[PDB]
Amino acid sequence: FTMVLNKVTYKINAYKIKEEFIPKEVHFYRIKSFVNEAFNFYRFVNFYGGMIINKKDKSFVLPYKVDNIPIDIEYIKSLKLEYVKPEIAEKLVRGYLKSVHKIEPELSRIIKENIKVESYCEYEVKKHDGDYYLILNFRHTASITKHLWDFVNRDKALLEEYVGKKIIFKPNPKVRYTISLVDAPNPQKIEEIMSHIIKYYKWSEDMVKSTFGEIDYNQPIMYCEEILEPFAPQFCNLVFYMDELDSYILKELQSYWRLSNENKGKIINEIAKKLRFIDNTPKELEFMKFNNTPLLVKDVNKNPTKIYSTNTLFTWIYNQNAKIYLPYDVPEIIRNKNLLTYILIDEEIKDELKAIKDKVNKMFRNYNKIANKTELPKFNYANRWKYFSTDDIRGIIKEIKSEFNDEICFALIIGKEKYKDNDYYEILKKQLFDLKIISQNILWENWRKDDKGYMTNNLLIQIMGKLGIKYFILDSKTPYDYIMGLDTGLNHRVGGCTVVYDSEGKIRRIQPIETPAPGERLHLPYVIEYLENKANIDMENKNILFLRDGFIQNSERNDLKEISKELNSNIEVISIRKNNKYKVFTSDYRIGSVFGNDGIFLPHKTPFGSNPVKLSTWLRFNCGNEEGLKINESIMQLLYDLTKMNYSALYGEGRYLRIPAPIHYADKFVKALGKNWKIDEELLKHGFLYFI
Ligand SMILES: [Mg+2]
């Protein structure tokens, strides 16, 4: 039991709901009276804080008794809340608090340059032990007041860099969409879009000019995730969360936006104090601490050696006494090859050419002297030093294209802090890859101050990853033959991606997934069928763990039961949610806990406040059976170990990822494909993270 474990106690944003606000009984009802096709049964029960039992029998459950728009209903049974499954009971208490006790209007009352910032509370109820807790989160939603088209400096390329961002169509800021695709500019469609919204809002033609301004004809025809209708970037606004922003952005802002987890806790406690439904004290929870799992690399004699961090992987570049580390595997496509390298320097930093040259040379000459007489490829950048401007990316692309390589090349981009314009560097990488040039950008200001070799080490880690080099592996082998990260973006040709990891934690495949057919969703049973039949991955007599930011539908459960017996494989699935309502009032990290069946995962150190990752519904399909597994120390350690299989050393908060590498990279590939990056089959098969 818990009396022998290394536990650290920490406060979370869970507050005990008072007795008077917990329903004693749940009540079963069915619609006895007639209902038409436009009835919308799900909305009807959801409004009255209920839940559907059977859609066909029009049966539901309410957290209260109704003594009689609402139609005539038939009472079936009453049941003590205590006899109800914890997951069902939590939602019924939420519905009771929402519908009967009006928690949403009371919460609004408590909380009542070109950025419009809005504040809101989000709530959920959790059953922990025999008690119900309200999860209380306070969020800040900011909106760019300047519209999407002018914001992106009227450039179709900059617009593509916004795929995966949240938007609102100006008149309705209550509907939040996600950019998933673009299209060529058309003056005919621009007229057609305007004419539709004039009709919907009963507008005069004058209204469009008044609302959106001087309309752009050569404007792109944007498209979105939820609605098949065409979008006009001039008519939309970017919407984001202040806590979803990167650390670098946060530094320039005032203290309130970079607040610590402890200080964020003090704000939550203030809302809890004014809320009559809950006790004021936050829930104290016991947390396990994850082990700092070692990594394996090869030594100069190609023998495995224990390493605890990648912070010393390329320390031998500067330090002559530092231990030389060699990769586990280099793909056959780039094995001991002289890669035609390009050195791209931003025009605005031309004065520091002497310091730039001496930095690129001292790094590559020390790398090449070791890359020679080993599997590692060499970088040959002789006479391929070129200047570029962010104002004309197309100009420098026309200069490179003139040289027909038709082979794998590299480009080291030396840039400067241009803020929003930093997306032009991402435009350069994307367009460079269309020409088969893998590239990495670095900010000169930061690299110039790197006297310890820290950034050089991180730059080389990222270059290795982009070249699909399996530098380091996990010291501990898992029961799983495969750990598969899955993201399902799309109603289009390619609807998703699976990033396949082996038992050692190395990328075996970056597998794009084609959607089944028009008018149907990309479900887990179909992904498995696709991997076996169209991707050529042997998935029989295997132990496979799937990682997804999503829940399994009821229809999938039986198909997954059949697939497990058909493959003679153990198929597991766990839900990993980066966007959740939990908050841990601490600056500590490498910690995990379980709150009413949910795993609360806090892996990485952060400069400012950090949000935990929620782990939910760990399922097992084996021998035609379905089994719900309890989130434990074993999986959390495995998930933590997977946040360490990072080659994105130059990005994010520190060395390790917030979310495990298989799911993290699946999401990054889906975004990259949305921004119209090229799909290079050979490279993805070899695990090249060229899109990072
Ligand atoms: Mg209170």
CA atoms of 583 and 609, how far apart (whole Å): 10
Radius of gyration over every alpha carbon of the chain, rounded to an integer in angstroms: 27
Find the catalytic residue in 243, 375, 549, 641: 549
C-alpha dihedral, 442 to 443 to 444 to 445, nearest 10°: -150
Q: How far is the CA of 602 from the centre of ligand 1 (A)?
A: 27
Largest CA distance in the chain: 85
What resolution in Å is listed for this PDB structure?
A: 2.3
Examine the residue annotation and report whether 520 is marked as an active-site residue of this protein.
yes
Q: How far is the CA of 271 from the centre of ligand 1 (A)?
A: 8
Q: Which helix (H) or strand (E) holds 523?
A: none
466 annotated as a binding-site residue = yes
* DSSP E strands, 503-631: 507-514, 543-548, 570-577, 591-595, 598-602, 613-622, 625-629
CA atoms of 162 and 238, how far apart (whole Å): 9
Q: Which helix (H) or strand (E) holds 566?
A: helix 554-567
Q: How far is the CA of 583 from the centre of ligand 1 (A)?
A: 18
487 annotated as a binding-site residue = yes
CA atoms of 285 and 595, how far apart (whole Å): 8
**Helices (H), ranges, 437-492:** 444-448, 454-466
Find the catalytic residue in 423, 487, 598, 680: 487
Which residue, 578, 568, 601, is CA-closest to 481?
568
Examine the residue annotation and report whether 549 is marked as an active-site residue of this protein.
yes
Q: How far is the CA of 280 from the centre of ligand 1 (A)?
A: 4
- Counting Cα atoms < 13 Å in the Cβ hemisphere of 603 gives 27
CA torsion sign, 580 to 586 to 592 to 597? negative
SS3 (DSSP) at 338: strand
CA atoms of 9 and 19, how far apart (whole Å): 26
Q: How far apart are the first and last CA of the chain?
A: 43
Find the catalytic residue in 226, 262, 286, 520: 520
State CA 574 to chain mean position distance.
Answer: 15
Q: How far is the CA of 19 from the centre of ligand 1 (A)?
A: 13
Q: How far is the CA of 262 from the centre of ligand 1 (A)?
A: 19
Q: How far is the CA of 16 from the centre of ligand 1 (A)?
A: 9
Q: How far is the CA of 269 from the centre of ligand 1 (A)?
A: 8
Find the catalytic residue in 504, 598, 641, 667: 667
462 annotated as a binding-site residue = yes
CB atoms within 10 A of CB 488: 21
Q: How far is the CA of 93 from the centre of ligand 1 (A)?
A: 17
CB atoms within 10 A of CB 20: 8
Examine the residue annotation and report whether 183 is marked as an active-site residue of this protein.
no
549 annotated as a binding-site residue = yes
Query: Which are the contacts of 190, defined by CB distance < 8 A and separation ≥ 6?
Result: 215, 216, 217, 219, 221, 232
Examine the residue annotation and report whether 351 is marked as an active-site residue of this protein.
no
Query: Which are the contacts of 200, defined by CB distance < 8 A and separation ≥ 6?
Result: none
Contact 466, 440 (CB under 8 A): yes
Angle subtended by helix axes 261-274 and 103-111, to nearest 10: 120
481 annotated as a binding-site residue = no
440 annotated as a binding-site residue = yes
Q: How far is the CA of 273 from the centre of ligand 1 (A)?
A: 4
**Helices (H), ranges, 376-442:** 393-401, 423-433
β-bridge pairing 14-16 and 131-144: antiparallel
CA torsion sign, 486 to 490 to 491 to 495? negative
Q: Cα–Cα distances in Å, from 301 out to 320, 374, 473, 600?
A: 17, 11, 17, 42
Report the residue count for the chain: 692
